[PDB]
């Protein structure tokens, strides 16, 4: 009867979102806690880390991941500079039918840190293939995107015209993104760029009949030293 008494007084997910100051934080299962109020308040504190997603999944963790084939682990490039890949291949192949200064320099002289996630980055099944999104930034580009466009990749990409910069200057930039500035369209042509119609031109500056730009500015019209640094 006591279990039923708590059930009878148990809150709906709508009520729990209502009284609670933050409602998103509130999951469908939080309504099943002993104290809905303390649990939502504890999930609504800064810097906390949410419980891993697979607690309820009937199947196992990485057992569910299973079936596809995976390429063997790829060595850190600075270990790869030693070539111990080649030495191991040669000895292994002879059987199948290295100097020391390079190794010490590889560990100390030229070893550098990797890219590491900050506190709150939980691992989950698919995070290695999760598509990085949200990047609403027009300025960021790729090399696969540039090449598969036929647009230059690397340091010349800025003078390599994105084929929709001419449509930015023609209909305005993408209308969902007024905040989009396009170099050579709403900011000046990048350094050493040239507006033009030849292969590699920046079009013509978006212009009104008095001589002001209709989009951005097509021509481009403290003491940050750290405190205690080594020498």
């Amino acid at each position: 009867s006591k279990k039923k008494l708590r059930r009878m007084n148990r809150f709906t997910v709508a009520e729990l979102k209502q009284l609670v100051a933050r409602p998103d934080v509130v999951e469908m299962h939080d309504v099943t806690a002993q104290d809905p109020k303390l649990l939502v308040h504890l999930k609504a504190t800064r810097n906390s880390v949410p419980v891993p997603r697979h607690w309820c999944f009937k199947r196992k963790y990485l057992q569910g991941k299973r079936g596809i084939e995976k390429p063997p682990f790829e060595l850190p490039d600075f270990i790869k500079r030693t070539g111990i890949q080649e030495m191991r291949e040669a000895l292994q192949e002879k059987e199948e039918q290295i100097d020391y200064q390079k190794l010490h320099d590889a560990f100390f002289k030229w070893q550098t840190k990797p890219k590491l996630t900050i506190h709150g980055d939980l691992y989950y099944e698919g995070k290695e293939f999760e598509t990085r999104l949200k990047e609403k930034k027009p300025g960021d580009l790729s090399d696969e995107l540039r090449i598969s466009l036929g647009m230059p990749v690397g340091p010349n990409a800025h003078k390599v015209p994105p084929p929709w910069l001419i449509a930015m200057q023609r209909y305005g930039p993408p209308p969902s993104y007024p905040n989009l500035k396009i170099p050579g369209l709403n900011s000046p042509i990048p350094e050493s760029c040239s507006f033009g119609y030849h292969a590699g031109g920046w079009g013509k500056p978006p212009v009104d009949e008095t001589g002001k730009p209709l989009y951005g500015d097509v021509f481009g019209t403290i003491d940050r030293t750290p405190w205690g640094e080594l020498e």
């Binding site: 750290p226 405190w227 205690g228 640094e229 080594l230």
Partner: protein, 332 residues
């Protein structure tokens, strides 16, 4: 960025102070514990100036500290109860000018924990046993005996655990070469935990309870417990055995109470108040620190009250039973 940290002038506030003949000779010196610095002063007798004989750093919070001295020994050691897990016994070598660590015994994890001892430290006057107590649930006792070469030796810990019991102050009781007794104010919150109404928070008064070592059987038994009228905050040992009666003075809010076990009845006084003060009348008054002076002839205590008035307390006794307590103003 990589940083290196030095000091420029060491801490200079004082949180405990004990006085002994720490260097072996009739001249008597002070040890003061700053926060995490421990340093020994000595006041020169004629001119009265005070000299900092030595100041060492201990990298650890010192929570309590006591002086103590074996029977007929002419030095005085230093028991120090830190926030570490260990009790340690130090001794000041006047020659080389440094504290030597005579002993260090471990009994728990480190840091100002709740149930791991170290806060309260008490010793029994004739030098036989030291007890170290937490704020809850744990008390230990060590016995200290001189060896063949009369160097110091420390026993294995005894044990007095008792669940759900805060401890406001612990102090050794003076008895002549009998079982040592320690007399620790207490309080027992266990039932107040389960009073959904809120009663047992009130009507739960604190109980003074004489523990007692038992040299014969080598353990520690709670001998006498007894409720106190109202909450008191610390105890003053009363030099017992030959000089003076035995027993303890309690210095509770607004009163001071001699109270000893046996048949001795309880004796009270209210604390004399400032003629026409300006204080908010509701605020009580308590005793903050205290200091016994004991001479071959007599003894008297000084005790100091919240506003800063000293009082010279003396005990008028009938040969074994104390009859009246007599306070008079001293200074401020």
């Amino acid at each position: 960025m990589f940083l290196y940290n030095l000091t420029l002038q060491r801490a200079t506030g004082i949180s405990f102070a004990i006085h002994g003949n720490f260097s072996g000779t009739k001249q008597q010196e002070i040890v003061v514990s700053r926060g995490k610095i421990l340093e020994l002063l000595r006041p020169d007798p004629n001119t009265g100036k005070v000299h900092t004989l030595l100041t060492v750093e201990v990298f650890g919070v010192i929570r309590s500290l006591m002086a103590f001295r074996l029977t007929g020994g002419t030095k005085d050691y230093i028991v120090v109860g830190s926030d570490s897990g260990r009790i340690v016994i130090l001794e000041y070598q006047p020659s080389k000018n440094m504290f030597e660590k005579i002993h260090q015994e471990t009994f728990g994890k480190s840091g100002c924990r709740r149930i791991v001892p170290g806060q309260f430290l008490a010793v029994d006057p004739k030098g036989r046993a030291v007890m170290i107590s937490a704020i809850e649930k744990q008390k230990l006792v060590y016995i200290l005996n001189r060896d063949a070469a009369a160097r110091l030796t420390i026993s294995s810990p005894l044990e007095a655990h008792k669940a759900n019991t805060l401890v406001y102050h612990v102090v050794g009781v003076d008895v002549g070469f009998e079982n040592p007794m320690f007399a620790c104010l207490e309080m027992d919150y266990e039932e107040a935990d389960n009073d959904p109404t809120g009663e047992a928070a009130a009507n739960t008064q604190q109980t003074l309870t004489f523990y007692e070592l038992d040299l014969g059987l080598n353990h520690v038994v709670r001998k006498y417990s007894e409720p106190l009228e109202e909450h008191g905050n610390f105890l003053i040992t009363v030099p017992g055995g030959s000089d003076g009666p035995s027993g303890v003075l309690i210095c509770s809010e607004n009163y001071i109470t001699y109270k000893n076990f046996g048949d001795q009845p309880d004796i009270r006084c209210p604390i004399p108040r400032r003629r026409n003060d300006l204080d908010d009348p509701e605020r009580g008054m308590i005793f903050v620190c205290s200091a016994t002076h004991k001479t071959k002839s007599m003894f008297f205590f000084l005790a100091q009250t919240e506003q800063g008035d000293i009082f010279k307390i003396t005990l008028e006794t009938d040969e074994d039973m104390v009859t009246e307590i007599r306070l008079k103003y001293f200074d401020t």
